[PDB]
Amino acid sequence: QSKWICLRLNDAIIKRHVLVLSEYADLKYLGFEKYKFFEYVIFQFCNDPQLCKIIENNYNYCMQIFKAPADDMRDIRHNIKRAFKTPVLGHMCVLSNKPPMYSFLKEWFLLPHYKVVSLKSESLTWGFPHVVVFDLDSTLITEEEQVEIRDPFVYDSLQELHEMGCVLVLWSYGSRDHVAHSMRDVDLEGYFDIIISEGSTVQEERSDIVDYNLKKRFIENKFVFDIHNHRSDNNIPKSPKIVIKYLSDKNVNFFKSITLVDDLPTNNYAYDFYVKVKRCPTPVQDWEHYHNEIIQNIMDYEQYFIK
């Protein structure tokens, strides 16, 4: 729980992006001209008032000051988007000069700064999208061996979601092999954007080919997720790290918000919204309230603050 401060660059010669500082003097690692590549830069609030005073004397950029005891990724993003009246923001940069130990921010994408100039821009949407994450396990299937959609209304609602310019990401924790048969039974390849599998487990991520039968164009959902917590518990969170990774692999580079729809609250690590799926061995046809929830969650920022 700390006070916090942020740079706002005068000329966003590169836009949307933000950086995080351990020292005000870290600027020396950045040196000449490199500063023009970042729109904002957060720093933990000065302990010495002279630092803040020198900041106040500096004219090279605008700045803001605030309290954020809420040491959370999404809450900090909310506060910054409030301060700078902006719906969408870029990635958070990092250097070999290791970041400050604000390691509660551990679970996120980390941008090796030099890539920033190398970054592409993407066709995939003409406007900045929202994103929604889904599962197979007990999720929107009926629970029997052969599954209906909980409503064909939902079936077509998935398609219409494209009208809003929002992204559909399914990561089955369930086993890889059966999902192909599942989609052959009911195909949403024309209805859904992104597919991932085998997330069920956390595994010892420490230092110590597919589509042979039918020409699917899928991939090894490679196990590249850290143990990340080095502790005795039982949790397999959905990983914003991996999600943003595959997004930028699809050149998806900016977004307004991300929501999770899942049967496990535990896996939600401060996702913007969570929809606990109702378990359903029969077609509940309840979707309209899910629709309402999602629509209002989207609408939150039409007032220019999520609340």
């Binding site: 020396k28 690692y29 040196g31 000449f32 070999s96 000069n97």
Partner: peptide
């Protein structure tokens, strides 16, 4: 590069020498 600021420091010492004389 991490090399970069070392190059800049070397240039700095260089010019610091140069200007005075």
């Amino acid at each position: 590069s991490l090399e970069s600021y070392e190059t800049l420091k070397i240039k700095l010492a260089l010019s610091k020498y140069m200007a005075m004389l």
